[PDB]
Design a protein around this ligand. Sequence first.
Ligand SMILES: c1cnc2c(c1)ccc1cccnc12
Length: 330
Amino acid sequence: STGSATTTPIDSLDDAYITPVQIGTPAQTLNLDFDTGSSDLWVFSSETTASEVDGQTIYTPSKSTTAKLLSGATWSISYGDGSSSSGDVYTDTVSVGGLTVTGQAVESAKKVSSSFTEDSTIDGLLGLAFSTLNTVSPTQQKTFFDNAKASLDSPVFTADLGYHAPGTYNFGFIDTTAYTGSITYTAVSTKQGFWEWTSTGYAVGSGTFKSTSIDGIADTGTTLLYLPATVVSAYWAQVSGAKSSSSVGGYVFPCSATLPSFTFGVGSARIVIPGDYIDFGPISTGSSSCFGGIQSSAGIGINIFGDVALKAAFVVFNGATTPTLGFASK
Ligand SMILES: c1cnc2c(c1)ccc1cccnc12
């Protein structure tokens, strides 16, 4: 089997991407944030604290004839950005663009943190990292990809995020018309539960490529590209007026600037992120200071190849016996 769904930016900055997901019987369609940096499929629901729901579409397990409460199971997640959510668990039918999983754990939110409530466009998350990170207790649950894997034509999923435009998540197949050239595959470590790989280096604009190992994760659930301080300082040094702002919380630059591109290495291959992809607009409404799309990972503890990097490539999340990541220009 295969599945194919369109993923859409939630706003004009591509802060996140939403993909419609069918849950239950009859189908309840929620727009979820497909996240390769986490492993919980959780949704806003009829059980979420009323004051914490503001515009989101909710999953009502009592209206699904296939929903079964998973006895004694609870979940609780805390994300890298400070957000959190928790609740109980049901098993139900979940479909993504024609691909169906029966008995998928659907984590129903009883509580969500302010940033989830404030984002009316995201009805929940669909985790695509390794099931070892799933927070369901006392019995850990599998991701949608893990549950579907055996049935897929090929044990893979691909991320093709668009820049200011719709894109696609495919399950079970590689669309050879969605990229140019060839896909370069690279080793993945699953030790931390992430799609963790090692970039071979970088270049800023038309500059000399620096060969240096950058260990990081391919994370569709993180907006920006988080890299070592030395790398990020080298990038922003090429932008007149750019500086690290402690008050804003990162590198900012004059909105009138034209940004240089950023290239990252995947083995001997190179992915070029166009400069416009690194512009995240005014730091505050009407400001002429803009927020950078490339930021230091010094405070995080891990480098993150978020949507800024991933949307410049056709990305293969290969769930073969030994998982690997594939990247191609597009
Ligand atoms: C991810 C993280 N931080 C940001 C954005 C996206 C977009 C704009 C912005 C403006 C000021 C500070 N942070 C951000």
